Symmetry: C2
Subunit: 356 residues, 2 copies
């Protein structure tokens, strides 16, 4: 039996060596062992204490060596977790927007909001992956969107949402030990790299750390070799295009290119993070539906959430078209809202899911 505490311990001892002897493929194998062992831990037995002790030890040693912030290790970790996932089988620019989280900022769900707005723009198709429940609260049974139903939804939907917990069963096995650990681990950066639809060909991936971002760009290129990718880090410490101060962008186009964004480049005022707060999924959904997708606010209203969504939508648009015309992105975003195209795109998805 290779999938044992003994095997995991041999991987941890490699991390304790000077210098460490754990390869990127060793981390892949270690994570398969960890996902096998954690499935046996259904009680607070002494066997569970022993397994949690060894899994804690391995993930903490990885973090201290910082190998879990190296592109090749991140890619191998994503690959291991995906062995426990449902993958979508499918027979045009298709985009995702998602962040790592871990910035501790409590900001509005701009990822799902901007994904919906971008999906109203002619020639854009959005397959947004993420979540822990914004769309969930708009009378949509998100459990119905799964490996068997995505192919059926695909052809007639400009917008789709895939709820990560329904695909990534491996991420479910580590949920309790991650909470107990209280420290970041390799698991904190895997979410964006686990998209179960291979047809996505461009994405924005937010990251919590300036230090992590360039290795994360390289990881994204390894996990998503087809994809043109923006990695984004807000200088205030934000896994998003920030509504306040500057954002750095690392650009992968299949060279690591870099540029910088600030709200003035979009013709927007700055808004403190306090003004772009999250209210949790139910109220975030209501704001999005009743204040934003309804057309109640416009460019020039200086409404913080509306502006935050418009800006991130503009970046998605410019990414989709291969240019940096940020103000044209704002125009297309504003049009998607005020034409009714954004709302009709979301309603088509919600209807399509209800019909299943």
């Amino acid at each position: 039996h290779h999938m044992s505490e003994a095997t995991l311990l041999s991987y941890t001892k490699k991390l304790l060596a000077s210098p460490p002897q754990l390869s990127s493929t060793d981390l892949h194998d270690a994570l398969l062992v960890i996902l096998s062992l954690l499935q046996k831990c259904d009680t607070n037995s002494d066997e569970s204490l022993s397994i949690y002790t060894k899994v804690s030890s391995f993930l903490t040693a990885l973090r201290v060596t910082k190998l879990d912030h190296k592109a090749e290790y991140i890619a191998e970790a994503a690959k291991a977790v995906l062995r426990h996932s449902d993958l979508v089988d499918l027979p045009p620019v298709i985009l995702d927007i998602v962040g790592t989280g871990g910035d501790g900022q409590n900001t509005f769900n701009v990822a799902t909001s901007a994904a919906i707005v971008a999906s109203g723009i002619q020639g854009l198709k959005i397959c947004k992956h993420g979540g822990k429940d914004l769309i969930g609260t708009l009378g949509c049974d998100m459990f119905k969107v799964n490996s068997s139903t995505v192919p059926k939804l695909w052809p007639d939907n400009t917008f789709m949402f895939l709820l990560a917990p329904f695909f990534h069963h491996g991420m479910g096995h580590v949920s309790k030990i991650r909470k107990f650990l209280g420290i970041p681990t390799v698991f904190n950066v895997l979410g964006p790299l686990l998209h179960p639809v291979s047809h996505v060909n461009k994405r924005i991936l937010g990251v919590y750390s300036k230090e992590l971002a360039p290795e994360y760009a390289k990881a994204a290129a390894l996990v998503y070799p087809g994809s043109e990718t923006f990695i984004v880090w807000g200088h205030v410490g934000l896994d998003e295009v920030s509504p306040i101060g500057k954002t750095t962008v690392w650009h992968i186009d299949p060279k690591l290119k870099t540029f910088q964004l600030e709200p003035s480049m979009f013709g927007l005022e700055e808004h403190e993070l306090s003004k772009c707060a999250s209210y949790g999924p139910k109220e975030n959904a209501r704001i999005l539906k009743e204040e934003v997708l309804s057309g109640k606010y416009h460019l020039g209203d200086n409404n913080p959430i509306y502006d935050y969504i418009l800006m991130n939508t503009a970046v998605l648009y410019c990414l989709s078209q291969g240019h940096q015309n940020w103000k044209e992105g704002i125009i297309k975003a504003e049009e998607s809202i005020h034409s009714g195209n954004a709302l009709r795109s979301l309603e088509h998805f919600i209807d399509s899911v209800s019909s299943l």
Copy 2:
């Protein structure tokens, strides 16, 4: 909210994740007090118990990877935190110990306990050996030797053995998670620093590595400020004075960092491979020590490997005790302790004292 909490322990782990780590030696002391409180209060099969083991594992593993737990001030603060959960011996106002850290991966004969017994038969020496099973198997219950009974045994014993688990309740609390971890942690180097009798004057402290030795010398001076101390490392990779090749000694002389080299030829002994000085198990080791050594069956010049191994380590204890490096005189004194019957008598007197408890 409370200081003794998972939240406090997590704050210390996060300090170890910083570049460079921000955990001070006094932080490690406090972290160990937290760990020992969390583990003492553990509710069996609770969700809290599983979270606690997760956070304690995390902290001790992060510490080991940073290697802060092998710096003198950290080792000493860690020993001092553990001792806050120990029973120290209170006695009324030359006494030696001999012990190794272990972790040399060498399953060699228990020369520390053996040499402690032979040295105890030398007139003018008193041995208070602390550690640990060999002494268990000789017909005295070591569980009877505790902080309350050492004062009773003290006055009329030339030899005592103190079994660490009956003093160090804090070491007891981490025993299970140490087994589950399966990796070395700070705990693996604390044993020699936890002697509960402050009256010990001098000691040999073996260490498993050359790298640890100089930091361990500084830690031992902090933990045992009164004590003249030999830190010893056998070049073959041994926390003992090696019966093959050279041993380095780091000499803590608080009257006066001096280091010197030992080899068996300096004692008038042939070298013996570690394979001829193996541990045959605690029952069988007790029989060898009692029937081959303390009986006087073997002599100096017979080149019996385990006998010579014991005789050399005894001679180092003796020279340490007297403030000289006349290693061959230490051998003469060790030889006489055996062949007079003094060594055996010292042992049997301690066994009889413990039995009477």
